[PDB]
Design a protein around this ligand. Sequence first.
Ligand SMILES: N#Cc1ccc(C[C@H](N)C(=O)O)cc1
Length: 307
Amino acid sequence: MDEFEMIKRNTSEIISEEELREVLKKDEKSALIGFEPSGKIHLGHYLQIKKMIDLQNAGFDIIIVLADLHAYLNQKGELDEIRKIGDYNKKVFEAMGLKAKYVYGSEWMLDKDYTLNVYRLALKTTLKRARRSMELIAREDENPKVAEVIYPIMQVNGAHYLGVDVAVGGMEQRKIHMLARELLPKKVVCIHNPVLTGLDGEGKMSSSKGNFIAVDDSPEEIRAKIKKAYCPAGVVEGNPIMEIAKYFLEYPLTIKRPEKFGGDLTVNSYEELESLFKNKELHPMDLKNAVAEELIKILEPIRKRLL
Ligand SMILES: N#Cc1ccc(C[C@H](N)C(=O)O)cc1
């Protein structure tokens, strides 16, 4: 539609936009996203869930894969310890306002029929394509393990096992999604979300990096992290404060600032906040204060539920 544009909104690419339109014409449609369990669920994760919500509202049946086996394979720790992290993740996503079927990797990824197809894919996959597909995913290892090349082929097969019409991931999943489109009999539509900039300006919002706003973060933590964050005046590109404002805030918005500092600015859209920021009219402190307070209101239900 419409459904199309709502879905295309705030994504980096759709492989392929055309095939997405075709899928939308169907009465029955399915979509998945998978996540390696992570102790902290941040704004990078929420952005993607909002995308699922968008697909959910467009008629898609949503599947969330808690990929405990992939994280095991990607050296995140012990299988039982990762499933418990995955139990917590389900609860967080179950607070984010999306009705979806939740599924653990370790349930069906050890199925005889599953395992059999993984081996069939291993025969079709070159070690070079499997190694290349993992560059932006693999935990830095000085001596690459056999688990590294099993990881993409198991991810590829999940889209097949589940029978999804669409696979959703961040931009770093692009190569595994490209592999999936070459190894599977049914080509799946691949929707890619942008990579959120970390709070310190360092590329990606990451759980192990400590430069993220977690969805369960208390108001004081949100204010503190927003305060220390990279946000020089006039810069929009790679500004994490500006990115949160783009992706998470509802517009029109009003920035409650001191009367002597310029009054009170009411912002019609993100792009209005953009031109005001780029043109020194809105100081970083004022932007920070408004962003912190709005974020506190948006994640208030998530936070509230998780206790
Ligand atoms: N089916 C299926 C499936 C989809 C995604 C993943 C994890 C993914 N590589 C991630 O980084 O989030 C694992 C399994």
